[PDB]
Amino acid sequence: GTAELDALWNLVEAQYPVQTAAVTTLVTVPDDYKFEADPPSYALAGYETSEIAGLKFPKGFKFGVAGAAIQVEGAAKAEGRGPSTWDYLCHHYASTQCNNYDPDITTNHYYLYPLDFARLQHLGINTYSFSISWTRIYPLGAGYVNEAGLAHYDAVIHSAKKYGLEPVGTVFHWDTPLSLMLKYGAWQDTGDQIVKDFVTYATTVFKRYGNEVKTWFTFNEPRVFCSQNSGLPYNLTYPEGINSTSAVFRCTYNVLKAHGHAVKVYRDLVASGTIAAGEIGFKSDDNYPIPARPGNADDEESAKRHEAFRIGIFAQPVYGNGDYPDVVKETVGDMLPALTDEDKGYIKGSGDIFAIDGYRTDISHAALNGIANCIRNQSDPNWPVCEEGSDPFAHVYPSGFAIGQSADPLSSWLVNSAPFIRDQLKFLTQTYPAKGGIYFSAFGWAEDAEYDRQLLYQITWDGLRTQYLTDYLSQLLLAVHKDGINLRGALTWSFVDNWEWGLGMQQKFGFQFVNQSDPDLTRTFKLSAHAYAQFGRNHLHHH
Amino acid sequence: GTAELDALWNLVEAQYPVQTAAVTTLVTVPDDYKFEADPPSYALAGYETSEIAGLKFPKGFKFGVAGAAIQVEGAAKAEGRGPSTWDYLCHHYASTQCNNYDPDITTNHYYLYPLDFARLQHLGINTYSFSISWTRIYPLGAGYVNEAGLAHYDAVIHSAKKYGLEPVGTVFHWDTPLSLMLKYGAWQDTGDQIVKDFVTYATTVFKRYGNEVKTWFTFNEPRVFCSQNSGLPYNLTYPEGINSTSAVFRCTYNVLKAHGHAVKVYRDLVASGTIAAGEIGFKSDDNYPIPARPGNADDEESAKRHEAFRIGIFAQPVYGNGDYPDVVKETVGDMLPALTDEDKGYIKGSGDIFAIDGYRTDISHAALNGIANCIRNQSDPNWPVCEEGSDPFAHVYPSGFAIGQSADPLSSWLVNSAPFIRDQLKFLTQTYPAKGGIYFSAFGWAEDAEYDRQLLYQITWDGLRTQYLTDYLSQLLLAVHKDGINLRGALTWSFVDNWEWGLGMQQKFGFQFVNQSDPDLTRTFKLSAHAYAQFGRNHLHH
Ligand SMILES: *[C@@H]1O[C@H](CO)[C@@H](O[C@@H]2O[C@H](CO)[C@@H](O)[C@H](O)[C@H]2NC(C)=O)[C@H](O)[C@H]1NC(C)=O
Ligand SMILES: *[C@@H]1O[C@H](CO)[C@@H](O[C@@H]2O[C@H](CO)[C@@H](O)[C@H](O)[C@H]2NC(C)=O)[C@H](O)[C@H]1NC(C)=O
Ligand SMILES: *[C@@H]1O[C@H](CO)[C@@H](O[C@@H]2O[C@H](CO)[C@@H](O)[C@H](O)[C@H]2NC(C)=O)[C@H](O)[C@H]1NC(C)=O
Ligand SMILES: *[C@@H]1O[C@H](CO)[C@@H](O[C@@H]2O[C@H](CO)[C@@H](O)[C@H](O)[C@H]2NC(C)=O)[C@H](O)[C@H]1NC(C)=O
Ligand SMILES: *[C@@H]1O[C@H](CO)[C@@H](O[C@@H]2O[C@H](CO)[C@@H](O)[C@H](O)[C@H]2NC(C)=O)[C@H](O)[C@H]1NC(C)=O
Ligand SMILES: *[C@@H]1O[C@H](CO)[C@@H](O)[C@H](O)[C@H]1NC(C)=O
Ligand SMILES: *[C@@H]1O[C@H](CO)[C@@H](O)[C@H](O)[C@H]1NC(C)=O
Ligand SMILES: *[C@@H]1O[C@H](CO)[C@@H](O)[C@H](O)[C@H]1NC(C)=O
Ligand SMILES: *[C@H]1O[C@H](CO)[C@@H](O)[C@H](O)[C@@H]1O
Ligand SMILES: *[C@H]1O[C@H](CO)[C@@H](O)[C@H](O)[C@@H]1O
Ligand SMILES: *[C@H]1O[C@H](CO)[C@@H](O)[C@H](O)[C@@H]1O
């Protein structure tokens, strides 16, 4: 094999090696596979409001679930894969950065996907969102191609379609190739090797999969991704002229460039009939918060600064006027490379569809020390947004009561803000309009302390996740019928409990429970999976 | 008090003493007291169903909250109080029986009650259910009376009525006088001194408060209480001829006798005009479970056995044919003293009102080794009900899915089983009829891991407690209109996070938060309090 791949894994496995799952072969779904019995008939009573009686989502609405390669696959060294930065991080700093977990095995989706798909068909899911592992295709990020990796996703996609799941592919879901980080700092690249290497990678997967996959996302949540570049292991190999503050905005630029160029390739492939016609964009996240004090001009300014730094910095170069928002430029200056007119030519209009991972909406309080004073000082704790960013403010009205129900406190950013969904959608489609509409591409619940339950029946009756999924879907439905939002789909994070980055398998986002103390990693439906099923039975067109 | 009060407390305090609250004086409520602001107006949407639109509880419905003296009061040693078995238990075995808590202070309701009552008025509560501390009235259980104790409840009752809360009094809520346990084993008394001592106590409080308190319960959950008598500190002082197993049914016998004789005294005081005419009963708890497999005769029999040991053993002697359930006698034998003809003269019909602490409904799986094999073997883990008692059975259908949402795993007996309320009330009113009707005398939610929250806004939006209280109230409202249940009130446990017995202040049951890290133990409304308030506004006659 490759000597530099072997060396990279050696580097990763130096304190401790990759562990292997109990099951390392593709599973066979017996024709007789017995699904666990339904919950009692009264279980779903009361979640659905009569406000939505009879309403349907548009024909062709993608009613789906979402995962991510490194979060669900496992098989971290299988069939020629190369390490990502996360494989390195959690094998060297698991105790302080990865909650003592690693993504070696996670849910073993890499080998269990046929069974997972069969279980999704049981619920009536019609769409399967996944991401491709870059280092399964190019184990060193650039150079040679790993055919076994390419063939693996052919099989996944084929299996998904067999079970009635339309496949939606994300190109990059945060799993940066270790090789590229070491060689030139990956997304910190002061030149443009990263764009070229991402373009080569994306081209390859478009060509290999574009006939089967007709909805593409280049990047999952690039703003959240680039904010992680401020830390380990990225800041072991910063290129000179880059530090942990500029690294965030050098990542932003390089990511916008990579997305624009990839999109040009994709459109060339569609326009030439090389691959099936399809649509492409990226997944935004976060929200335009409501001001803590209505009609307070400082709170409105910090709210706008929140949207600018959290959504606008990517959305406006793509769906906007082609530049970064004016407030972002006035605050970060030379740390955020200007978009040359060549840059803008690739990036403006490079979004056929918008997608918002709309987990929640926040509340903005202007910095207590004054916004002007805060934006001058890169060391102020509320820089650059210059709202009070801590939880006692970001979720709390002047009343001291919260905007809504909190989830697990290890993911304290997550709240149930369903009544605010429609205004988020209105703002986004009027501000970042895309010819192909908007997906609600990720939303899900981390039930408080679900990881501390020991008995299955206590886990599976998951009220607040059931409530959150139902509430959010209801507002999506109403957004279509009452606001005329061109809503294309709804993808819940996630169909299984999975490896939640720094929190590892502790944090539980699935509408199915994964038994991590069982060698087979048995899935079990939670009540929320059945609530999702019932909602699609009631509010999808089936004729 | 006597030197015997000093000796008993010296015994209780032998390893570490009773701690004192930062505030040791009765608080006064400033006229400008500022309640915290309301939740957003969308916060309560969607909880109430249309099934109940326009429906109202009967006129005079008691719409209230419940506490118990030792769970909320604190002031464990103040104003002459004597120690209870729990004061001893948690000052001596705290790390193994009390979760390293004790009831020295709890919520400091003993000094804070005027403020608590102002906050309950702001919610439109109209009924306050409370228990009287026996050892505040008789510090030794028997003998001398502590006048400062009697005067304290005079002022509590007066403050309650002033804030528009009808006072509902429980004579005994588990706080056994330590002196009586050392002297003759308290409720394990193989004679009848425990009955005399309880009756003298009940008399004293009936006379003192019966003009202001018109709804009385002798005992809170006597089945649960008596099950504690199998353990510490009660099993350090069993009389000869009593063991951890018979202590439960000796307790059961004496409580029934104490109840009958106390009710007798209650009626004589009413007949003679010494006190206002009211109603007395006791609070049952638990449920008649559904069988795991419907139509399975084994599951149906173990379900009946459950009701017999959990409800029938107190309810049948009082509200039914006046004897213990047959299955109870057949299984327990001479451990359960027979009810004499005289006994029955006091006990039978001694219940003007039924009260059920209707937290939950269970599922009954017949014992897997077979009911016949289990009833004959006191060593069997499932004796005497001879259903599978463990959590993976008591809450789970054969399907593997639960009957309902679980609450916090440290109180796993609690689930949300609102769909089953109307059936429970049908069974109870048809089987244990009371002229005065039935109270839903306790129900509430322990929000999972609420104790691990560190920011207040995360505590107060308490979705599953809010859902639970609304689900339960809704079904209660339907029991009145669709089933014709003479439901006399609904008292939720509890108005404050408080001292939850062996879990101490860790388990959270209040629709208000209590800040145990704050010297003033400040209260904050959770969303559930506002949900309770709004249900009262929508569904009480005014
Ligand atoms: C590189 O980024 C990491 C973030 O992972 C920084 O880690 C911080 O280290 C400081 C040292 O005092 C701690 O106070 C912080 O708590 C750490 N942050 C986190 C989130 O772990 C690290 O300091 C950075 N190093 C350099 C060279 O800038
Ligand atoms: C990280 O890099 C940035 C940019 O080089 C530093 O921020 C600058 O600090 C200089 C002080 O010489 C300011 O006058 C510049 O205006 C700041 N940058 C810009 C362009 O806004 C930052 O301090 C660097 N070092 C850290 C954060 O350790
Ligand atoms: C998770 O799976 C494990 C293993 O399949 C289940 O636990 C085992 O149950 C047996 C009972 O026969 C115990 O004696 C074993 O010790 C358990 N195995 C362990 C702990 O590794 C368990 O029931 C499942 N958990 C849930 C919540 O479904
Ligand atoms: C008195 O009752 C207590 C209950 O608090 C009993 O405590 C048990 O002790 C046994 C033996 O060590 C343990 O196996 C149990 O786990 C304890 N039960 C608890 C604390 O849940 C004690 O055994 C009883 N003493 C006598 C004399 O029977
Ligand atoms: C506690 O005392 C009771 C009193 O009966 C004991 O119950 C008896 O147990 C013996 C042997 O197991 C049986 O032969 C009798 O039939 C039982 N009596 C009754 C009335 O059923 C019980 O065994 C004692 N338990 C302990 C632990 O002391
Ligand atoms: C910048 O913020 C840091 C942290 O609040 C503070 O110590 C420092 O004084 C600030 N500097 C200025 C110029 O405000
Ligand atoms: C009674 O139950 C125990 C379980 O504690 C068991 O070991 C024993 O065999 C059973 N039967 C008897 C004692 O006849
Ligand atoms: C409890 O009180 C302490 C001290 O007053 C306070 O600092 C803390 O924030 C409070 N905790 C809450 C409200 O959860
Ligand atoms: C377990 O086996 C896998 C192959 O499936 C290896 O990649 C891993 O290093 C471990 O030996
Ligand atoms: C998958 O991989 C493991 C080693 O990694 C083997 O033991 C297993 O039989 C299968 O080949
Ligand atoms: C793949 O195939 C192996 C047999 O080599 C099984 O053991 C495994 O469970 C999976 O089906």
Side-chain angles (χ1 to χ4, degrees), chain A residues 42 391 397 402-403 405 407 453 457 461 463, chain B residues 42 395 397 401-403 405 407 453 457 463:
Chain A
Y42 56 81
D391 289 318
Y397 287 112
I403 193 187
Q405 171 79 56
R453 300 283 193 178
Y457 78 92
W461 198 302
Chain B
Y42 58 82
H395 313 289
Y397 286 108
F401 210 86
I403 188 169
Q405 172 79 54
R453 297 296 190 165
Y457 80 91

PDB file of all heavy atoms in Angstrom, chain A residues 42 391 397 402-403 405 407 453 457 461 463, chain B residues 42 395 397 401-403 405 407 453 457 463:
ATOM      1  N   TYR A  42     -52.143   5.041  22.364  1.00  0.00           N
ATOM      2  CA  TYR A  42     -52.340   6.369  22.915  1.00  0.00           C
ATOM      3  C   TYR A  42     -51.039   7.158  23.016  1.00  0.00           C
ATOM      4  O   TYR A  42     -51.069   8.324  23.410  1.00  0.00           O
ATOM      5  CB  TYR A  42     -53.010   6.263  24.291  1.00  0.00           C
ATOM      6  CG  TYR A  42     -52.247   5.403  25.268  1.00  0.00           C
ATOM      7  CD1 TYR A  42     -51.161   5.921  25.968  1.00  0.00           C
ATOM      8  CD2 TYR A  42     -52.610   4.077  25.499  1.00  0.00           C
ATOM      9  CE1 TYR A  42     -50.459   5.150  26.857  1.00  0.00           C
ATOM     10  CE2 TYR A  42     -51.904   3.296  26.389  1.00  0.00           C
ATOM     11  CZ  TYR A  42     -50.828   3.852  27.071  1.00  0.00           C
ATOM     12  OH  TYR A  42     -50.105   3.102  27.958  1.00  0.00           O
ATOM     13  N   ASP A 391     -24.824  31.690  27.899  1.00  0.00           N
ATOM     14  CA  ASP A 391     -26.169  31.128  27.991  1.00  0.00           C
ATOM     15  C   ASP A 391     -27.121  31.947  28.841  1.00  0.00           C
ATOM     16  O   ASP A 391     -28.297  32.050  28.451  1.00  0.00           O
ATOM     17  CB  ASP A 391     -26.098  29.682  28.501  1.00  0.00           C
ATOM     18  CG  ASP A 391     -25.507  28.735  27.460  1.00  0.00           C
ATOM     19  OD1 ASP A 391     -25.859  28.870  26.270  1.00  0.00           O
ATOM     20  OD2 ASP A 391     -24.681  27.880  27.822  1.00  0.00           O
ATOM     21  N   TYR A 397     -35.013  36.032  28.077  1.00  0.00           N
ATOM     22  CA  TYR A 397     -35.655  37.322  27.977  1.00  0.00           C
ATOM     23  C   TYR A 397     -35.246  38.230  29.130  1.00  0.00           C
ATOM     24  O   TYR A 397     -34.830  37.754  30.189  1.00  0.00           O
ATOM     25  CB  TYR A 397     -37.170  37.161  28.022  1.00  0.00           C
ATOM     26  CG  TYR A 397     -37.777  36.595  26.777  1.00  0.00           C
ATOM     27  CD1 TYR A 397     -38.348  35.324  26.768  1.00  0.00           C
ATOM     28  CD2 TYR A 397     -37.805  37.343  25.604  1.00  0.00           C
ATOM     29  CE1 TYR A 397     -38.920  34.810  25.611  1.00  0.00           C
ATOM     30  CE2 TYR A 397     -38.384  36.849  24.450  1.00  0.00           C
ATOM     31  CZ  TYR A 397     -38.933  35.584  24.455  1.00  0.00           C
ATOM     32  OH  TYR A 397     -39.495  35.106  23.303  1.00  0.00           O
ATOM     33  N   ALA A 402     -36.837  31.921  29.999  1.00  0.00           N
ATOM     34  CA  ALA A 402     -36.156  31.496  28.778  1.00  0.00           C
ATOM     35  C   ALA A 402     -37.049  31.660  27.556  1.00  0.00           C
ATOM     36  O   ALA A 402     -38.282  31.748  27.651  1.00  0.00           O
ATOM     37  CB  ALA A 402     -35.720  30.032  28.872  1.00  0.00           C
ATOM     38  N   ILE A 403     -36.401  31.683  26.383  1.00  0.00           N
ATOM     39  CA  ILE A 403     -37.153  31.698  25.128  1.00  0.00           C
ATOM     40  C   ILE A 403     -37.949  30.414  24.953  1.00  0.00           C
ATOM     41  O   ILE A 403     -39.030  30.427  24.358  1.00  0.00           O
ATOM     42  CB  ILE A 403     -36.215  31.940  23.920  1.00  0.00           C
ATOM     43  CG1 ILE A 403     -37.031  32.279  22.669  1.00  0.00           C
ATOM     44  CG2 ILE A 403     -35.296  30.742  23.662  1.00  0.00           C
ATOM     45  CD1 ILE A 403     -36.199  32.360  21.386  1.00  0.00           C
ATOM     46  N   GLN A 405     -37.942  25.738  26.028  1.00  0.00           N
ATOM     47  CA  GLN A 405     -37.386  24.556  26.677  1.00  0.00           C
ATOM     48  C   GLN A 405     -35.923  24.330  26.294  1.00  0.00           C
ATOM     49  O   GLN A 405     -35.577  24.305  25.111  1.00  0.00           O
ATOM     50  CB  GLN A 405     -38.234  23.339  26.275  1.00  0.00           C
ATOM     51  CG  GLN A 405     -37.677  22.006  26.681  1.00  0.00           C
ATOM     52  CD  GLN A 405     -37.957  21.724  28.134  1.00  0.00           C
ATOM     53  OE1 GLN A 405     -39.115  21.750  28.562  1.00  0.00           O
ATOM     54  NE2 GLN A 405     -36.900  21.488  28.914  1.00  0.00           N
ATOM     55  N   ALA A 407     -32.637  21.754  26.115  1.00  0.00           N
ATOM     56  CA  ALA A 407     -32.301  20.335  26.041  1.00  0.00           C
ATOM     57  C   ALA A 407     -31.211  19.994  27.056  1.00  0.00           C
ATOM     58  O   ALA A 407     -31.088  20.654  28.099  1.00  0.00           O
ATOM     59  CB  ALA A 407     -31.855  19.967  24.614  1.00  0.00           C
ATOM     60  N   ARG A 453     -29.774   6.861  31.563  1.00  0.00           N
ATOM     61  CA  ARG A 453     -30.768   5.814  31.705  1.00  0.00           C
ATOM     62  C   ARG A 453     -30.096   4.460  31.549  1.00  0.00           C
ATOM     63  O   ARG A 453     -29.221   4.287  30.700  1.00  0.00           O
ATOM     64  CB  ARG A 453     -31.861   5.979  30.659  1.00  0.00           C
ATOM     65  CG  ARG A 453     -32.599   7.299  30.737  1.00  0.00           C
ATOM     66  CD  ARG A 453     -33.605   7.282  31.915  1.00  0.00           C
ATOM     67  NE  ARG A 453     -34.552   8.393  31.878  1.00  0.00           N
ATOM     68  CZ  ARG A 453     -35.529   8.549  32.769  1.00  0.00           C
ATOM     69  NH1 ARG A 453     -35.673   7.661  33.747  1.00  0.00           N
ATOM     70  NH2 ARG A 453     -36.355   9.587  32.682  1.00  0.00           N
ATOM     71  N   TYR A 457     -36.865   0.838  28.503  1.00  0.00           N
ATOM     72  CA  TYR A 457     -38.184   1.470  28.432  1.00  0.00           C
ATOM     73  C   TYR A 457     -38.130   2.910  28.911  1.00  0.00           C
ATOM     74  O   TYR A 457     -38.970   3.727  28.517  1.00  0.00           O
ATOM     75  CB  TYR A 457     -39.224   0.692  29.255  1.00  0.00           C
ATOM     76  CG  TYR A 457     -39.108   0.957  30.747  1.00  0.00           C
ATOM     77  CD1 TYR A 457     -39.853   1.964  31.362  1.00  0.00           C
ATOM     78  CD2 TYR A 457     -38.236   0.214  31.531  1.00  0.00           C
ATOM     79  CE1 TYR A 457     -39.721   2.225  32.707  1.00  0.00           C
ATOM     80  CE2 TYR A 457     -38.112   0.448  32.868  1.00  0.00           C
ATOM     81  CZ  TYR A 457     -38.856   1.458  33.456  1.00  0.00           C
ATOM     82  OH  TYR A 457     -38.704   1.690  34.793  1.00  0.00           O
ATOM     83  N   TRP A 461     -39.367   6.041  25.601  1.00  0.00           N
ATOM     84  CA  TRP A 461     -40.461   7.010  25.720  1.00  0.00           C
ATOM     85  C   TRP A 461     -39.835   8.388  25.952  1.00  0.00           C
ATOM     86  O   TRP A 461     -39.679   8.841  27.090  1.00  0.00           O
ATOM     87  CB  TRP A 461     -41.438   6.629  26.834  1.00  0.00           C
ATOM     88  CG  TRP A 461     -42.785   7.349  26.675  1.00  0.00           C
ATOM     89  CD1 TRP A 461     -42.988   8.702  26.638  1.00  0.00           C
ATOM     90  CD2 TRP A 461     -44.078   6.745  26.495  1.00  0.00           C
ATOM     91  NE1 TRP A 461     -44.331   8.974  26.484  1.00  0.00           N
ATOM     92  CE2 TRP A 461     -45.017   7.788  26.381  1.00  0.00           C
ATOM     93  CE3 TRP A 461     -44.533   5.419  26.436  1.00  0.00           C
ATOM     94  CZ2 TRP A 461     -46.384   7.550  26.193  1.00  0.00           C
ATOM     95  CZ3 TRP A 461     -45.903   5.184  26.252  1.00  0.00           C
ATOM     96  CH2 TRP A 461     -46.799   6.242  26.121  1.00  0.00           C
ATOM     97  N   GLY A 463     -40.182  11.995  25.621  1.00  0.00           N
ATOM     98  CA  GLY A 463     -41.218  12.996  25.432  1.00  0.00           C
ATOM     99  C   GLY A 463     -40.737  14.273  24.770  1.00  0.00           C
ATOM    100  O   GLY A 463     -41.329  14.743  23.794  1.00  0.00           O
TER     101      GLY A 463
ATOM    102  N   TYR B  42     -46.558  32.630  24.604  1.00  0.00           N
ATOM    103  CA  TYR B  42     -46.683  31.400  23.826  1.00  0.00           C
ATOM    104  C   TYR B  42     -46.305  30.156  24.619  1.00  0.00           C
ATOM    105  O   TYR B  42     -46.566  29.045  24.155  1.00  0.00           O
ATOM    106  CB  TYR B  42     -45.819  31.469  22.557  1.00  0.00           C
ATOM    107  CG  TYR B  42     -44.353  31.715  22.825  1.00  0.00           C
ATOM    108  CD1 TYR B  42     -43.499  30.680  23.185  1.00  0.00           C
ATOM    109  CD2 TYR B  42     -43.824  32.995  22.725  1.00  0.00           C
ATOM    110  CE1 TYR B  42     -42.151  30.920  23.437  1.00  0.00           C
ATOM    111  CE2 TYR B  42     -42.491  33.241  22.954  1.00  0.00           C
ATOM    112  CZ  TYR B  42     -41.660  32.213  23.314  1.00  0.00           C
ATOM    113  OH  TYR B  42     -40.340  32.499  23.553  1.00  0.00           O
ATOM    114  N   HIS B 395     -43.499  -1.272  34.599  1.00  0.00           N
ATOM    115  CA  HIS B 395     -43.826  -0.175  33.693  1.00  0.00           C
ATOM    116  C   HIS B 395     -43.874  -0.561  32.227  1.00  0.00           C
ATOM    117  O   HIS B 395     -44.092   0.320  31.390  1.00  0.00           O
ATOM    118  CB  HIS B 395     -42.823   0.976  33.853  1.00  0.00           C
ATOM    119  CG  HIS B 395     -42.570   1.335  35.276  1.00  0.00           C
ATOM    120  ND1 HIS B 395     -43.516   1.964  36.058  1.00  0.00           N
ATOM    121  CD2 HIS B 395     -41.500   1.111  36.075  1.00  0.00           C
ATOM    122  CE1 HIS B 395     -43.030   2.129  37.277  1.00  0.00           C
ATOM    123  NE2 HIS B 395     -41.810   1.616  37.316  1.00  0.00           N
ATOM    124  N   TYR B 397     -45.049  -2.988  28.828  1.00  0.00           N
ATOM    125  CA  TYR B 397     -45.912  -3.929  28.136  1.00  0.00           C
ATOM    126  C   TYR B 397     -45.077  -5.096  27.628  1.00  0.00           C
ATOM    127  O   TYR B 397     -43.858  -4.972  27.472  1.00  0.00           O
ATOM    128  CB  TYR B 397     -46.598  -3.256  26.951  1.00  0.00           C
ATOM    129  CG  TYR B 397     -47.711  -2.305  27.312  1.00  0.00           C
ATOM    130  CD1 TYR B 397     -47.541  -0.937  27.180  1.00  0.00           C
ATOM    131  CD2 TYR B 397     -48.937  -2.771  27.773  1.00  0.00           C
ATOM    132  CE1 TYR B 397     -48.555  -0.057  27.507  1.00  0.00           C
ATOM    133  CE2 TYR B 397     -49.964  -1.896  28.097  1.00  0.00           C
ATOM    134  CZ  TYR B 397     -49.760  -0.539  27.964  1.00  0.00           C
ATOM    135  OH  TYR B 397     -50.752   0.363  28.269  1.00  0.00           O
ATOM    136  N   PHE B 401     -42.400  -1.681  25.058  1.00  0.00           N
ATOM    137  CA  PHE B 401     -42.609  -0.255  25.254  1.00  0.00           C
ATOM    138  C   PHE B 401     -43.312  -0.007  26.581  1.00  0.00           C
ATOM    139  O   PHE B 401     -44.079  -0.845  27.062  1.00  0.00           O
ATOM    140  CB  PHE B 401     -43.411   0.343  24.116  1.00  0.00           C
ATOM    141  CG  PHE B 401     -43.086   1.780  23.860  1.00  0.00           C
ATOM    142  CD1 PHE B 401     -42.024   2.124  23.038  1.00  0.00           C
ATOM    143  CD2 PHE B 401     -43.833   2.784  24.446  1.00  0.00           C
ATOM    144  CE1 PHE B 401     -41.713   3.463  22.802  1.00  0.00           C
ATOM    145  CE2 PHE B 401     -43.524   4.129  24.214  1.00  0.00           C
ATOM    146  CZ  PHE B 401     -42.468   4.461  23.394  1.00  0.00           C
ATOM    147  N   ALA B 402     -43.024   1.154  27.171  1.00  0.00           N
ATOM    148  CA  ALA B 402     -43.512   1.503  28.495  1.00  0.00           C
ATOM    149  C   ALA B 402     -44.968   1.943  28.438  1.00  0.00           C
ATOM    150  O   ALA B 402     -45.480   2.339  27.393  1.00  0.00           O
ATOM    151  CB  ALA B 402     -42.672   2.622  29.109  1.00  0.00           C
ATOM    152  N   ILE B 403     -45.620   1.906  29.600  1.00  0.00           N
ATOM    153  CA  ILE B 403     -46.967   2.451  29.714  1.00  0.00           C
ATOM    154  C   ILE B 403     -46.979   3.954  29.438  1.00  0.00           C
ATOM    155  O   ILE B 403     -47.972   4.487  28.933  1.00  0.00           O
ATOM    156  CB  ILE B 403     -47.536   2.134  31.104  1.00  0.00           C
ATOM    157  CG1 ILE B 403     -49.018   2.511  31.175  1.00  0.00           C
ATOM    158  CG2 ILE B 403     -46.728   2.852  32.202  1.00  0.00           C
ATOM    159  CD1 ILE B 403     -49.679   1.968  32.413  1.00  0.00           C
ATOM    160  N   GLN B 405     -44.339   7.978  29.748  1.00  0.00           N
ATOM    161  CA  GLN B 405     -43.088   8.674  30.020  1.00  0.00           C
ATOM    162  C   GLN B 405     -42.578   8.383  31.430  1.00  0.00           C
ATOM    163  O   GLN B 405     -43.323   8.500  32.413  1.00  0.00           O
ATOM    164  CB  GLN B 405     -43.301  10.175  29.849  1.00  0.00           C
ATOM    165  CG  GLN B 405     -42.127  11.035  30.288  1.00  0.00           C
ATOM    166  CD  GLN B 405     -41.041  11.063  29.241  1.00  0.00           C
ATOM    167  OE1 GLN B 405     -41.295  11.386  28.066  1.00  0.00           O
ATOM    168  NE2 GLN B 405     -39.813  10.702  29.649  1.00  0.00           N
ATOM    169  N   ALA B 407     -40.298   9.559  34.658  1.00  0.00           N
ATOM    170  CA  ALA B 407     -39.665  10.698  35.314  1.00  0.00           C
ATOM    171  C   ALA B 407     -38.211  10.345  35.657  1.00  0.00           C
ATOM    172  O   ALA B 407     -37.650   9.373  35.143  1.00  0.00           O
ATOM    173  CB  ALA B 407     -40.462  11.110  36.564  1.00  0.00           C
ATOM    174  N   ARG B 453     -29.058  20.923  36.830  1.00  0.00           N
ATOM    175  CA  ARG B 453     -29.054  22.231  36.183  1.00  0.00           C
ATOM    176  C   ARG B 453     -28.292  23.242  37.029  1.00  0.00           C
ATOM    177  O   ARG B 453     -28.390  23.234  38.260  1.00  0.00           O
ATOM    178  CB  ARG B 453     -30.479  22.729  35.962  1.00  0.00           C
ATOM    179  CG  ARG B 453     -31.328  21.879  35.045  1.00  0.00           C
ATOM    180  CD  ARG B 453     -30.725  21.901  33.639  1.00  0.00           C
ATOM    181  NE  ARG B 453     -31.628  21.292  32.691  1.00  0.00           N
ATOM    182  CZ  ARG B 453     -31.530  21.411  31.370  1.00  0.00           C
ATOM    183  NH1 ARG B 453     -30.564  22.161  30.828  1.00  0.00           N
ATOM    184  NH2 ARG B 453     -32.430  20.806  30.596  1.00  0.00           N
ATOM    185  N   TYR B 457     -32.760  29.729  34.074  1.00  0.00           N
ATOM    186  CA  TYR B 457     -33.649  29.649  32.917  1.00  0.00           C
ATOM    187  C   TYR B 457     -33.807  28.211  32.423  1.00  0.00           C
ATOM    188  O   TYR B 457     -34.860  27.861  31.873  1.00  0.00           O
ATOM    189  CB  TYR B 457     -33.133  30.546  31.786  1.00  0.00           C
ATOM    190  CG  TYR B 457     -32.007  29.914  31.001  1.00  0.00           C
ATOM    191  CD1 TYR B 457     -32.269  29.142  29.879  1.00  0.00           C
ATOM    192  CD2 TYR B 457     -30.680  30.086  31.386  1.00  0.00           C
ATOM    193  CE1 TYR B 457     -31.251  28.550  29.163  1.00  0.00           C
ATOM    194  CE2 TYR B 457     -29.646  29.511  30.662  1.00  0.00           C
ATOM    195  CZ  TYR B 457     -29.939  28.744  29.554  1.00  0.00           C
ATOM    196  OH  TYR B 457     -28.925  28.145  28.845  1.00  0.00           O
ATOM    197  N   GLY B 463     -40.657  21.205  30.919  1.00  0.00           N
ATOM    198  CA  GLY B 463     -41.652  20.713  29.975  1.00  0.00           C
ATOM    199  C   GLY B 463     -42.408  19.482  30.448  1.00  0.00           C
ATOM    200  O   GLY B 463     -43.629  19.400  30.301  1.00  0.00           O
TER     201      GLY B 463
END
